[PDB]
């Protein structure tokens, strides 16, 4: 460094940096770049130093330099091909690098056809394009985009005939829709099965009656949801509640009917609904005038803590017997299991049941190394280096009592 | 036939599974063997190709497995070493970041595909609610994968389909400050031009109103939070749409499920009694004395709704008045009255105990009793259930835990994994 | 005064335009919903035609105007101002630009429906081209396009390319690279302006070498950058590719700047390149470019500007000098001050 200083110069400084780089020394190298003043270089050399491999920032350094066959040589040598694999892709030969990922990656070969696919498109050559479209993991939104980049529309016919794909007959089908050729994206929704897009299309003409045969025929349940949808601001409140039961949409159907005030249907939906509808609805019941009904669904309910607190309330004999004996298995499961006792539990049955193999962790977390190695000689588990050093801490023995445990476990492990 | 040798068939069978494209089973497998550094590499690799190929949802997904990789360290002891905090500050950021993923997938989702000019009203309130999250969450992070252009283009095109004047403006402006394509400048300009004339004050009945608080609050609030006070809003995953939901805390020295033996008992004692019932007083007090104001601002609006005369209010005020004399955040404690006049289906707790069998426990109660809500414990999201049904009948995966059903039976058997 | 055509059974007439000064507006400018006034006190207002009112006012304008021509859609105006001035304004900055270059005596400007950013200008015997570049860096650019014929020799100002229009005659409008100009006997010729005139003479079909570099330099005068490379693909000369990557560089068009540079042989750049087209921040795009390109200082200014000075830190860092780098440092974030002065001791 001495020497150095008293002449300085941008050709020996790089001088310097390639002397660095066939040394195999890296602080004096990014030194020599910091001399040279070369941004570039150094931003590239900040985002390499993430790397555990020093032989990969010898090599960036070297194809920042331009020495590419050194640093081909380097890759060779690391044992590392991915970024050998950006280098070859970067340089322009992709053919190679296709061949390079084939026989040693097979991870980024989607990757590498994507990149060859959008240098293909930058070169105007559709056909290969579209090709490694489908060689590569998605061509379905790839190809009309770039197809209507080009604005040739007609080959996109030829490519959606050939293909006969759904997602390909939506998106030509709102293509249409999108230039108010409604007849045609009518024609390529039914070919796509898409009911929805038939319901608001038709209900954007009020055609109300065609929709009707079609939700009626195909029974689709998010068509009928939208028509249900409709007929709320259409005035049709039960068959909009039928709908929604139809669709499988409890709440909105069942809130609806308990605001204009219907009785079977709320029910006669409830009991074929989840747990909360059912409890809302014997809620809303208890604040009907016949509360009995609230007390039989109650009795159906998922809840029957509180139907014995009803039962007792209501001081009823028969349903207060049967629900006592409900509540006596209620009890039953919750005394199963709980969930401190769970953890507490499940630790032990674990130990009981066996599996030592995933047994080992827990007792590593809870430093029993004697049981861990008893465990170990008693199933004949494989004691790996890591199992050592994770047992026998790599830190020296801050006691004269921690040595002394130390060196009996590693003995026991000999 | 030899239960004692596992590991020698799993592990050339791991190999076997990074040779084909299965890289998730290789993942599981390398996660139960043990060894995790090369997994956790290829994993962000992965990450990283996903990102790269517009791959959102998986990348995600990427970063939702790496947040459960960390938790899993953290797992390393219980006492208050920094280890502990900046892994579980790394697993929030993770987790942030996998919803912002999630999020940005969406919306361009939406924009990718040529807009409708007559779309659908739910479809558009979604992509709206979506894009107004998103930027909500962000801010100015401007993480890796996002280009902040998108979503701010779609949200004012969504809002000009949807008056939302002032968002409208303020994303235009944004954008302006932003750089777009020549293609949609123009039109930005003109849409600008257009929209100075109309009125201003938003159109109501869209801002999401702040739970505890009954205050109205702006669409873009910072980093998701509402400036009446300190308090995270919570929406469900499928829709983007704001939940009636509150956060409340344990005590520590009251075991929580001895507790809940102990407060079901409160709820059956408290109804044949003749010494009356806290819980049912609320509802009565509720029902006889109703105070309901409402005042009109520029941005804001303040709801005076406080008919319902419960303890938890009365507590949920006066901390309130404590919050505002003090200007900082303190989460509420609760002791065993008020949760004693609790009651069972209401709380709808977040465990992890599956990743780490003690590490945390977050307790939120719902507001609307009526409104059904479904935690998934496997990720720990919420969803109304309303299309949570529907989801599950088009696909048997959850979206964000990407596990099987519970409907349907146990499918990883030792073929899957 | 206002109209509607359509409607006659209405009895109100149009609220009427002008103020108590009630005199002659000197420029009338009707767009598809907006409608443009510009007094004689040099005043100009914008009006809503649906809701009747003075959305956008500018009073100063300079010291006083002639003449004006909006665009078809509103957004862009050029004004004409006395002695032979000429400015653009804007209504959504509400700032003027100075024009630099214009004639004295030019009576009308004709905008073009298939690119807002090029138009034209009518002299009386002579047509000039013009463009508005707003993706140049740190500069809104307005410059008379030239003509030259050197082998990439010179890059410096120069004569204005010239159209040469006959005696008599008057273009309709400009379109597509085509002017509908009007001759007796009611003729229409589409002809073309000696800038458009050798990309649409140009073919490729065998391809050449003097008429493919013409082509090849009036691309890079028009910013055709797709032209451009398949120009450059065709003529394997490096020279060639570096500065045509540079200069897709200096106009952030970044695929055609990694095209190039990839073409050329050379990574160095193009890992960079791509580690910039991830990123979308404005400010941090421009000084990014800036550092890559050319000097340092303006980058350093452009980071300063955006909301991340920590990247000018550690650029300054990277440049080591000791005054800019710690002032800087003390200045913005004085918590990373141990790390950058362990580089000065081993200084
Ligand atoms: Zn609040
Ligand atoms: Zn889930």
């Known amino acids: 460094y001495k020497s150095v200083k008293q002449i300085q110069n941008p050709s020996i400084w790089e001088k310097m940096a390639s002397m660095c780089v066939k040394t195999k020394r890296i602080d004096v190298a990014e030194i020599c770049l910091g001399n040279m003043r070369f941004a570039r270089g150094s931003k590239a050399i900040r985002e390499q130093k993430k790397e555990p491999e020093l032989d990969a920032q010898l090599a960036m350094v070297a194809i920042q330099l331009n020495m590419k066959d050194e640093a081909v040589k380097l890759y060779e040598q690391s044992k590392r091909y991915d970024l050998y694999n950006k280098m070859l892709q970067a340089e322009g030969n992709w053919e190679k690098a296709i061949q390079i990922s084939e026989n040693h990656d097979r991870i980024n070969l989607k990757n590498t056809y994507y990149r060859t696919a959008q240098m293909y498109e930058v070169s105007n050559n559709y056909e290969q394009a579209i090709l490694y479209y489908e060689k590569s993991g998605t061509h379905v939104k790839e190809v009309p985009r770039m197809l209507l980049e080009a604005g040739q529309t007609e080959q996109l016919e030829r490519y959606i005939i050939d293909k006969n794909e759904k997602p390909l007959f939506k998106w030509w089908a709102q293509y249409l829709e999108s230039n108010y050729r409604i007849e045609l994206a009518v024609k390529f929704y039914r070919q796509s099965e898409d009911y929805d897009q038939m319901v608001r299309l038709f209900l954007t003409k009020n055609d109300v009656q065609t929709a009707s045969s079609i939700c009626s025929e195909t029974n689709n349940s998010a068509a009928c949801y939208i028509l249900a949808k409709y007929l709320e601001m259409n005035g049709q409140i039960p068959e909009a509640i039928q709908y929604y039961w139809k669709s499988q949409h409890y709440t909105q159907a069942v809130r609806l009917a308990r605001e204009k005030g219907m009785d079977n249907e709320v029910m006669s939906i409830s009991l074929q609904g989840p747990n909360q509808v059912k409890l809302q609805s014997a809620a809303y019941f208890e604040e009907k005038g016949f509360k009995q009904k609230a007390v039989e669904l109650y009795k159906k309910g998922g809840n029957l803590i509180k139907a014995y607190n009803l039962a007792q309330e209501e001081k009823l004999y028969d349903e207060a017997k049967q629900i006592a004996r409900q509540i006596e298995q209620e009890e039953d499961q919750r005394n199963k299991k709980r969930d401190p006792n769970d953890l507490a539990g499940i630790i032990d049955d674990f130990i009981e049941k066996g599996q030592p193999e995933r047994a080992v962790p827990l007792m590593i977390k809870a430093k029993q190394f004697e049981r861990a190695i008893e465990t170990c000689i008693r199933f004949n588990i494989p004691i790996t280096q890591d199992l050592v050093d994770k047992i026998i801490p790599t830190e020296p023995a801050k006691n004269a009592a921690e040595e002394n445990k130390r060196k009996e476990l590693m003995k026991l492990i000999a | 036939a030899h239960p004692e040798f596992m590991e020698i068939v799993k592990l050339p069978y791991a190999n076997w599974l990074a040779k084909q494209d299965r890289y998730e089973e290789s993942l599981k497998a390398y996660r139960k063997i043990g060894k995790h550094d090369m997994a956790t590499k290829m994993l962000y690799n992965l990450s990283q190709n996903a990102v790269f190929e517009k791959r959102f949802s998986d990348a995600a997904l990427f970063t939702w497995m790496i947040a459960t990789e960390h938790l899993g360290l953290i797992r390393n002891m219980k006492a208050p070493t920094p280890e502990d905090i900046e892994n579980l500050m790394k697993f929030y950021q993770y987790r942030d970041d996998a919803e912002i993923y999630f999020a940005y997938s969406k919306v361009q989702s939406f924009v990718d595909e040529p807009f409708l000019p007559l779309s659908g009203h739910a479809y558009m309130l979604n992509i709206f609610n979506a894009a107004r999250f998103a930027i909500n969450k962000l801010g100015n992070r401007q993480l890796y994968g996002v280009q902040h252009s998108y979503l701010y283009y779609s949200l004012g095109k969504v809002s000009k389909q949807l008056e939302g004047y002032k968002t409208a403006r303020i994303c235009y402006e944004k954008l302006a400050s932003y750089k777009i394509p020549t293609e949609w400048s123009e039109e930005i300009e003109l849409s600008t031009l257009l929209i100075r004339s109309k009125p201003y004050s938003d159109q109501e009945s869209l801002l999401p109103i702040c739970n505890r608080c009954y205050n109205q609050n702006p669409a873009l609030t910072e980093g998701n939070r509402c400036s009446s006070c300190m308090h995270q809003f919570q929406n469900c995953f499928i829709s983007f749409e704001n939940l009636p939901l509150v956060e409340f805390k344990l005590d520590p020295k009251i075991t929580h499920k001895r507790f809940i033996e102990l407060i079901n008992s409160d709820k059956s004692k408290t109804q044949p009694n003749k010494k009356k019932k806290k819980a049912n007083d609320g509802w009565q007090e509720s029902h006889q004395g109703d105070q309901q104001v409402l005042t009109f601002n520029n941005s804001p609006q303040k709801g005076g709704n406080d008919n319902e005369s419960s303890p938890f209010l009365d507590k949920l005020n006066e901390v309130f008045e404590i919050q505002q004399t003090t200007q900082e955040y303190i989460p509420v404690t609760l002791d065993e009255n008020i949760v004693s006049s609790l009651s069972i289906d209401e709380v709808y707790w977040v465990d992890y105990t599956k990743y780490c069998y003690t590490a945390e426990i977050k307790y939120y109660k719902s507001m609307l009793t009526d409104i059904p809500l479904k935690n998934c414990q496997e990720c720990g999201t919420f969803y109304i259930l309303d299309e949570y049904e529907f989801e599950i009948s088009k696909t048997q995966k959850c979206p964000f835990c990407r596990s099987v059903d519970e409907r349907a039976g146990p499918q990883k058997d030792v073929f899957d994994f | ?347």
Request: glycine share 6%; net charge negative.
């Open chain 3, 1 to 347: 005064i206002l109209h509607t055509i359509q409607p006659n059974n209405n009895v109100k007439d149009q609220k009427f335009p002008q103020i108590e000064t009630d005199k002659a507006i000197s420029g009338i400018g009707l767009t598809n919903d907006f409608l443009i006034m510009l007094d004689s006190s040099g005043k100009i207002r914008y009006y809503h035609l649906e809701d009747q009112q003075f959305v956008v006012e500018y009073k100063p304008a300079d010291c006083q105007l002639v003449k004006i021509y909006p665009n078809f859609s509103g957004t862009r105006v050029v004004c004409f101002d006395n002695k032979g001035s000429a400015y653009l304004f804007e209504p959504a900055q509400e700032q003027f630009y100075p024009l630099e270059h214009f004639p004295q005596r030019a009576e009308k400007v004709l905008w073009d429906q298939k690119d807002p950013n090029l138009f034209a200008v009518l002299q009386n015997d002579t047509l000039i081209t013009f463009i508005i570049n707003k993706n140049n860096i740190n500069g809104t650019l307005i410059q008379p396009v030239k003509e030259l014929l050197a082998i990439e020799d010179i890059k410096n100002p120069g004569p204005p390319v010239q159209t040469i229009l006959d005696r008599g005659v008057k273009p309709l409008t400009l379109s597509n690279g085509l002017l509908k100009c009007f001759t007796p006997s009611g003729s229409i010729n589409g002809q073309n302006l000696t800038s458009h005139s050798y990309l649409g003479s140009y073919k490729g079909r065998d391809d050449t070498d003097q008429g493919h570099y013409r082509f090849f330099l009036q691309n890079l005068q028009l910013h055709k950058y797709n032209n451009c490379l398949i120009a450059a693909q065709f003529l394997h000369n490096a020279v060639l590719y570096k500065e045509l990557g540079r200069k897709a560089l200096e106009f952030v068009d970044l695929d055609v700047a990694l095209k190039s540079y990839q073409l050329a042989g050379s990574l160095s750049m193009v890992m960079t390149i791509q580690s910039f087209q991830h990123i979308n921040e404005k400010n941090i795009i421009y000084g990014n470019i800036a550092m890559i390109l050319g000097q340092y200082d303006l980058a350093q200014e452009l980071f300063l500007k955006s909301s991340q000075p920590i990247l000018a830190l550690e650029m300054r860092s990277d440049i080591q000098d000791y005054l800019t780098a710690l002032n800087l440092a003390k200045s913005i974030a004085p918590q990373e001050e141990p790390f950058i002065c362990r580089r000065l001791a081993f200084q």
